[model samples]
Target: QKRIRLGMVGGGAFIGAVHRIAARLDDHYELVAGALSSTPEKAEASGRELGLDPSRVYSDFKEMAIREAKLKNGIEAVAIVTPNHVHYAAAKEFLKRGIHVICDKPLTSTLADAKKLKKAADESDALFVLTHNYTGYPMVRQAREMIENGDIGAVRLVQMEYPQDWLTENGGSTGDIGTHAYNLGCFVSGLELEELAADLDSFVGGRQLDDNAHVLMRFREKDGTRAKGMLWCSQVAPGHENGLMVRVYGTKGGLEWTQKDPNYLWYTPFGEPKRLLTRAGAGASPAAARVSRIPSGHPEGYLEGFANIYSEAARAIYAKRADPSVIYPTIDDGMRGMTFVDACVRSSERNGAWIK
Candidate 1:
């Protein structure tokens, strides 16, 4: 089978490199072009390093979109790996020309841009896959299916947290790791956050955005189940690095998964001891095993999790002729993430009052 012809925007950062590796890991994409950087020299240099055709590497995404659309072997999809601010502009150019888009998370820097991007995506005859790559983990998928199948019974409480020390000095964790925390909570628990109260703080001097946030969430009930959630995201926390964790509790049982130990999920039925479930191991659901590559007990972390999203995208792209039943995050997921961030900002600005 022929791989998808891929073009990338923004290869000047760490995430750009990760996108390349994720696309290649599944052997479903072949990178042929990129608008790597706004600076022509930097863009050209980066393109050459990746062995892209010199003529297909441009300094601007608009030019790349226009030229590539005219090529016989143009990109079938474009990966937007730029900053939050550039996501909308770069994705718009590609989507309008009928190229599928796989964009980085947090949709856009501003809620207004997110709305506009949603409109652009709606109008286009292309697929918009959002790279909330953490959802691609086998264990996480297992938890979601377990929750949905009532293995955990009616969920009552959700605890989600992501703490990192990288921005202890001066920065906001809300946009960086906070979105991932929010997405994971909703994805696993299958809950729609109806309202939330947030307390945002910037402990670092002169920082523009909050480095820490404490949020309370109320999820709409389904079948007489009332679910409440709490989220704590911090870049100022010490002795932690990408400490993302989610724990859900219900009438029948509870589920726990942590990013540091990506392969294992903890489940405990009412009045029973906790059971450790590995990807594709005993008690692993078909949802988990379907995405699992290696045998049980093997470790799979960040890279493979990311590659799963690409692999799923490949399934969707190929299935475009038929089923198109891919399990990757879509633009709607991106919108929900943006909504979560927007709500947090609004609630914080209003002195941590409850916001819809």
Candidate 2:
């Protein structure tokens, strides 16, 4: 199949570069256009850097969306790698134009915008992908498959830690890293959340958003009882760099996976000794092996994981027909991630009062 023409919004930023590489990694996409920055000059400069045609570059995302729609071979899809607040706006333009939209995480800055984006996505024929990169990891899929196979049986507890040192002095750890934790727990255990209590903090001075968050989640009742989850996301933890980890327990066993050491997963049967499962190893599941690009014992993280999501999207993009086989995050995940953020902030305002 021919490469999908790809466009991008905010392609001058760090995450923007990440998206570009991920899109190109599988050779499924061709970068053709962009509204790379807030300003005309920066957008133009980024377009030049990427060797994009001047006519295909624009100062605004919506402008490119409109103009590109009229082109003979304009972008069939667009990656929205801008700020959280800009996701909904940029996504809507491309979605309405029937161009597939792939957005980076945390979904939207506000819950209301998440709802609006959800509605826009529902109305459009275009596909909407939310980049929850960790889900793309092979070992992560191994954990998911294990749960689904009832190898662990009736998930009872979920524990996740997503900590880093970068945003410590500045950020939104809850919406940023917390979404990854929250989503991963759900993705692996296949459980829906009931409600949560959150204790949010901005330890750094003059911070507009919380740099740390402790979330206590109650999942909906299933398999005899409701499961519990504890998620900690922090940007203030020293000496930690994207120290993301998750451990899930069930009646029969338990599973653990960590981002820093992603090639393997630890599984422990309640009455048996712990067993280690490597990506593509004999113990690995077909689900885990499907998106994996290399052999087990090798390494895959960040870029490879992110590209897995891109490749999955490209699979869906190629098939106009609905393919149940494709696995990827959608707008629903984004909406829920936003709701998680909204609920956390409110619960914190009420001093960690339980919400719903």
* Candidate 2 residue pairs in clash (backbone atoms < 3 Å): none
For model 1, residues 52-158, the per-residue Cα lDDT tens digits are 88988999999999999999999999999988899999999999999999998879998899999999999998888999999999999999999999998898999
The 10-residue segment with the lowest total lDDT in model 1: 317-326
Q: List clash counts for every candidate, in order.
A: 0, 0
334 Cα displacement, candidate 2 (Å): 0.6
Tell me the lDDT of model 1 at 66: 93
Off by over 4 Å in 2: 167-171
Candidate 1 clash pair list: none
